[PDB]
């Protein structure tokens, strides 16, 4: 599956950001949401051809993408931050890199700091691309409905196979045992982060009109379905620890 993940890995997406324009929160947040829309088209194309995922019913595929989109987006952001800047900045796109200054102007400074902490962890662990690609699949399968999916057994089989796949990757001991522990603790830490990101996302989505924070059609459809489920307690995060 590791060779498959390397080939289907989505190419970098440009924000189309103009650096000579004013750094207002409305402009910054709207640019990032339009970027999220373009990135998510690739994410869904990547998901569609994943070994095992293609065997889940379409309704379970939609549920998993709607629950995990924020986690996949933040994890990929930290991956680019690590690979292009050695986790000094938040590399949203090649033409949109956040420093402390942009973080303050985006009106989401603490959440940016929270997303930066994950990039810092990637530098500390010296995360490999192979480890990253399996962890991304585990994030796609990290949240399910409270009453489970339509094909819960098929889901559990796929997820166990990807956990085993991560164990096989780190065994390439002692250090490999500590690595599996550290990579799975890092996966669980995404739940707390994503909970805070979605809180601000849901607020800006509700207050889109007053705030003038644009959302592309891709994000409107996902958030319209996701928001009622999360807010009513229908989401069930899956943890490796606790």
């Amino acid at each position: 599956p590791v060779m498959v993940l390397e080939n289907i890995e989505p190419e970098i997406v440009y924000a189309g950001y103009d650096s000579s324009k004013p750094d207002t929160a409305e402009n910054l947040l709207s640019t990032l949401n339009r970027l999220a829309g373009k990135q998510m088209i690739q994410v869904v194309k990547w998901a569609k051809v994943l070994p095992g995922f293609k065997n889940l019913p379409l309704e379970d595929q939609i549920t998993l993408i709607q629950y995990s989109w924020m986690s996949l987006s933040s994890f990929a952001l930290s991956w680019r931050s690590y690979k292009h800047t050695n986790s000094q900045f938040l590399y949203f796109a090649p033409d949109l890199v956040f420093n402390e200054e942009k973080m303050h102007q985006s009106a989401m400074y603490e959440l940016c700091q929270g997303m930066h902490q994950i990039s810092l962890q990637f530098v500390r662990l010296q995360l490999t691309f192979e480890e990253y690609t399996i962890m991304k699949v585990l994030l796609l399968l990290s949240t399910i409905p409270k009453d489970g999916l339509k094909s819960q057994a098929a889901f559990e089989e796929m997820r166990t196979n990807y956990i085993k796949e991560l164990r096989k990757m780190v065994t390439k001991s002692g250090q490999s045992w500590q690595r599996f522990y550290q990579l799975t603790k890092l996966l669980d830490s995404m739940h707390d982060l994503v909970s805070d990101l979605l809180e601000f996302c849901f607020y800006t989505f509700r207050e889109s009109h007053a705030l003038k924070v644009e959302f592309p059609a891709m994000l409107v459809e996902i958030i319209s379905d996701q928001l009622p489920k999360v807010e009513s307690g229908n989401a069930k995060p899956l943890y490796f620890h606790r």
Binding site: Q61, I62, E221
Partner: peptide, 10 residues
């Protein structure tokens, strides 16, 4: 047909 539906059933 939603955008997620379209992209998963191409």
């Amino acid at each position: 047909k939603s955008l997620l539906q379209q992209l998963l059933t191409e």
